[PDB]
Ligand binder design. Structure first.
Ligand code: HIS
Ligand code: HIS
Ligand code: HIS
Ligand code: HIS
Ligand code: HIS
Ligand code: HIS
Ligand code: MG
Ligand code: MG
Ligand code: MG
Ligand code: MG
Ligand code: MG
Ligand code: MG
Lengths: 146, 146, 146, 146, 146, 146
């Protein structure tokens, strides 16, 4: 069964402590899949989207001038943000903020070759009141064909 | 007074392959936090709730006769389900089905001891068409005080 | 040209204990506004709509053969149900059930007389687990022109 | 049946005219439950949340430095706001505003002692266009364990 | 069958190229229904609502000082915006923008005379990243009694 | 390198009266884009998805054994359904039913040729009470890369 958990990889990259992630990186290298990681502190959801788009482009995971790529990523991002926000994608507008780690992974996860590329966006972090220590954890995942 | 990623432990339990998670089981022994794990396959959301209620009651993670317990858990469940369903909380009614693992972890994560117990619910798995193999991954996490 | 809290009258009717609401009944006699009251126990949302449609038609609060009437009422119903369900409009499908009282009040609340008739729908009751006693209160109000 | 309608109390406090609320206050006094009341005019939802948090803290209904308290209240607040907004928690962003009265009540409503404390957040008021008299009534309720 | 597709008229006005719309205009003239058209480029949803309200008033399709009229239109507008936004009515807050054509049509579409007036709001256009050519089409319709 | 309103073609197909749409059929012959058309009457949303999946597979608009195809289509379907349902994606469960026409169009709309194929799903019809004649129009459009 050649099939791979591309989401789980993204999530693991997002949640494991730096330096615990070695095997995942190794797998990605073998596979020769593109990926990136990053962090964002946000009281506005669009900041999250921006950070992710920016990161994806800078690390060459997506072609920023090619809409199909950016449409695919956009919607995967919203899917993840939804796991984090659980209903309303409002942060500041609802008196909360988030600090999040993110990761993106673009690959060919399925067994059949024709399935082609897919992208995964993962978010992990905390969400809470804009006060130190009044917070808890959150998670999200988005998957899209690309 | 150390503070813990209770969400990440639950997430890790739901997503890792069995026998790969021993460390997390060990952290929990040490803390002496209660917890359970499960699998559920659903085309009806209410099924997901029921399986987790049954497994939390069965492994003594919560008290099925105390409403404050079951209330705390119910909302953690819906939060995790939002991550999985990403908006509309519907499965069969939107012609999709879910194949999931879950974990619930109850404990006292915060440094401060007056922060009491908190509970976490995690889901990891696949969501897709009724036909098998046409599907992708999904995830969710709910946190509540308890 | 006095202006009235038609929503509050309906709310009061749905929430007060019987025999405790006589004043509100009296205000309504005076205005000569039509109105009805009801009870519904539901694990299916559509049941809530149906019971209120039946009781508004039956006490001549609206005309079941005039779509503008039934349209105005239907949207007032969904507005009140959002208050009760607080997001996802699902009951059994999210493993909860509702025990509710309702009231509909139709009248001309505004100072201005060209503001026509308006209708109000109120819900008050309990929402909880299928087991009895594991539940809490809930409420909702929908307003529409009619 | 020692059980009490803590939500109905909050709602009544929120909706009754000043000086009609005497009995409710009396009950609360007997019970020795903590509570507060207040008003907020808002074109931004976060204003509502802020007002309520602030009020709860100032009147000593909740411990503002204790997350479990503030998590409990936060989520009860969002539940109420939902009854008021009926779908989207957007005010200004959707060209409406709200004027609302609020109330919070913290108590031990259930018969069994072990159920412990619960909190209720109630909203009542009007919502409408940012123009005088283009408005109608709205209501909300949130209940949480605390 | 005297009944008319008032929504389809609004939608057609919104989507057809200028000068392809002649027959629709003709029908409207015969019927002596009021209507208007317009365009709005928005990164904020309230801009859309504002544009539509403004246009409706200026062209005398609705009485801006009469709430029933403006309530009816408001809710029809939100219904259309929903088709355009598909879930969250957020534009800038979610890193997208929209360019849209709109139309409103007020008439007596049904066969029975007593059905009275109804209003239709239609939106057609593109939605996308705030970059040229990274965009796709969108549509919406709202219908309300008036 | 001309760019096309693929959404509008699909919309037009779903909403025009048969025999009135010949031009659009002709544009499609010219482009050589695949497409299908359908009717569905539903009180269950999943029925809408199924009918469109069946008609896209049947007229070779997509490949039922390739997940990337069916994934792209599924999300375009839910987008169009949001336009029709306007929030809650429920029909019977909210005591309403839908009478709809649909169309799917797959092609390469953009000027740029590397923008690949994209798919469009359109719905037009009526939504209302179970009784016939108590209903109004509705619409929706979903777009995805494919
Ligand atoms: N607990 C909130 C975040 C928060 C806001 N204020 C306090 N906490 C959530 O689930 O998103
Ligand atoms: N891709 C869908 C699931 C699905 C239904 N049919 C095919 N796929 C989702 O993200 O939930
Ligand atoms: N507490 C849930 C209802 C419930 C389901 N199970 C237990 N309680 C609500 O707020 O709707
Ligand atoms: N009627 C709107 C408020 C409003 C905005 N503009 C006019 N009225 C509501 O239900 O929230
Ligand atoms: N494709 C998005 C719009 C967008 C934002 N960024 C890129 N595209 C939508 O469906 O609304
Ligand atoms: N008017 C409702 C449908 C309906 C149900 N009952 C009567 N009408 C809608 O907009 O979806
Ligand atoms: Mg899109
Ligand atoms: Mg998907
Ligand atoms: Mg929380
Ligand atoms: Mg609850
Ligand atoms: Mg309204
Ligand atoms: Mg309607």
């Amino acid at each position: 069964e050649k099939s791979v958990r591309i989401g789980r990889q993204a999530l693991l990259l997002a949640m494991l402590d730096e330096g615990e992630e070695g095997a995942i990186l190794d797998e990605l290298r073998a596979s020769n899949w593109r990926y990136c990681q990053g962090r964002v502190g946000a009281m506005e959801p669009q900041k999250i989207v921006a950070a992710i788009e920016t990161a994806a482009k800078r690390h060459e995971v997506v072609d920023g001038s090619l809409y199909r790529d950016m449409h695919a990523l956009y919607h995967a991002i919203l899917e993840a943000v939804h796991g984090v926000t659980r209903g309303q994608v409002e942060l500041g507008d609802l008196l909360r903020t988030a600090g999040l780690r993110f990761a993106v992974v673009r690959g060919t996860p399925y067994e059949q070759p024709k399935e082609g590329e897919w992208i995964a966006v993962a978010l992990y972090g905390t969400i809470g009141a804009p006060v130190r220590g009044l917070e808890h954890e959150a998670v999200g995942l988005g998957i899209n064909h690309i």
